[PDB]
Amino acid sequence: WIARTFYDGPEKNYEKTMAILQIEAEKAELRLKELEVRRLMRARGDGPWYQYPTIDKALIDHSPKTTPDN
Amino acid sequence: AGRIASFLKNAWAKEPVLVASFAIGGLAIILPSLSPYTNYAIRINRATPYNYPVPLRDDGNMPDVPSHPQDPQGPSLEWLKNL
Ligand SMILES: CCCCCCCCCCCCCCCCC[C@@H](O)O[C@H](CO[C@H](O)CCCCCCCCCCCCCCC)COP(=O)(O)OCC[N+](C)(C)C
Ligand SMILES: CCCCCCCC/C=C\CCCCCCCC(=O)O[C@H](COC(=O)CCCCCCC/C=C/CCCCCCCC)COP(=O)(O)OCCN
Structure with missing residues (x-):
């Protein structure tokens, strides 16, 4: 009676643990990958992250400058 | 109108320098936009x-x-000469 009215079968907890473990393992591997990706992007700078500004080239004036040699 | 006229007449007396300065500055601000x-x-x-x-x-x-x-083609300066 107690088992019927207060508790559930082993399958529920078993498969819930399976799902929880799967989620947590994915989160762990995601964290490790994210750290490695950050290291690579900060080292090389070829990614979208850690992009530091440079001078905009639309500011350059391309016109004769009173002197042939610029 | 009447109060403004009274104020201008009262300021033109005993304070003519300030009235002249404000008038000249106001003209210097306004007139260039109309010339x-x-x-x-x-x-x-x-x-x-x-x-x-x-x-x-x-x-x-x-x-x-x-x-x-x-x-003949190219900008001319006849308007400048006639000025
Ligand atoms: C001899 C026979 C009796 C044996 C003794 C049994 C006495 C049991 C008392 C102790 C109970 C321990 C806790 C049990 C309940 C745990 C919480 C919850 O799980 O229980 C819910 C039920 O709890 C009850 O609704 C409430 C219990 C409250 C007991 C209070 C007792 C004392 C009250 C005294 C009041 C006196 C009147 C006021 C006087 C001033 C149903 O659970 P549920 O989420 O479905 O579980 C999922 C699995 N299912 C679907 C298969 C069930
Ligand atoms: C939009 C133009 C603005 C730019 C022009 C102005 C450039 C320079 C002029 C401004 C300088 C600073 C002015 C500071 C004002 C302080 C005046 C003040 O406090 O003096 C009062 C008195 O002066 C006044 O009444 C205040 C101003 C009075 C009005 C002056 C002219 C206002 C505008 C008049 C003409 C406006 C436009 C033209 C209208 C006429 C028709 C064309 C007290 O005098 P005290 O020496 O301290 O003591 C005397 C008592 N024992």
């Missing part, structure tokens, strides 16, 4: 060549660009 010779001054400033006019390479598709200064 028709301001654009003439801008055009005169544009017509003053400080730099060498660098010629453009002819490519067979430049009819409005002169080949010689004596040519």
Whole structure:
């Protein structure tokens, strides 16, 4: 009676643990990958992250400058 | 109207320097926006060549660009001369 009215079968907890473990393992591997990706992007700078500004080239004036040699 | 006239008459007495200064400053602010010779001054400033006019390479598709200064095509300064 107690088992019927207060508790559930082993399958529920078993498969819930399976799902929880799967989620947590994915989160762990995601964290490790994210750290490695950050290291690579900060080292090389070829990614979208850690992009530091440079001078905009639309500011350059391309016109004769009173002197042939610029 | 009447109060403004009274104020201006009371200030024109015993404070003529301030009245004159405010009138002159107000005129200096307002009048330039209405004068028709301001654009003439801008055009005169544009017509003053400080730099060498660098010629453009002819490519067979430049009819409005002169080949010689004596040519009719190109900007003129007859408006400047008549001024
Ligand atoms: C001899 C026979 C009796 C044996 C003794 C049994 C006495 C049991 C008392 C102790 C109970 C321990 C806790 C049990 C309940 C745990 C919480 C919850 O799980 O129980 C819910 C039920 O709890 C009850 O609704 C409430 C219990 C409250 C007991 C209070 C007792 C004392 C009250 C005294 C009041 C006196 C009147 C006021 C006087 C001033 C149903 O659970 P549920 O989420 O479905 O579980 C999922 C699995 N299912 C679907 C298969 C069930
Ligand atoms: C939009 C134009 C603005 C730019 C022009 C102004 C440039 C320079 C002028 C401003 C300088 C600073 C002015 C500071 C004002 C202080 C005046 C003041 O406090 O003096 C009062 C008195 O002066 C006044 O009444 C205050 C101003 C009075 C009005 C002055 C002219 C206001 C405008 C009049 C003309 C406006 C436009 C033209 C209208 C006329 C028709 C064309 C007290 O005098 P005290 O020496 O301390 O003691 C005397 C008593 N024992």
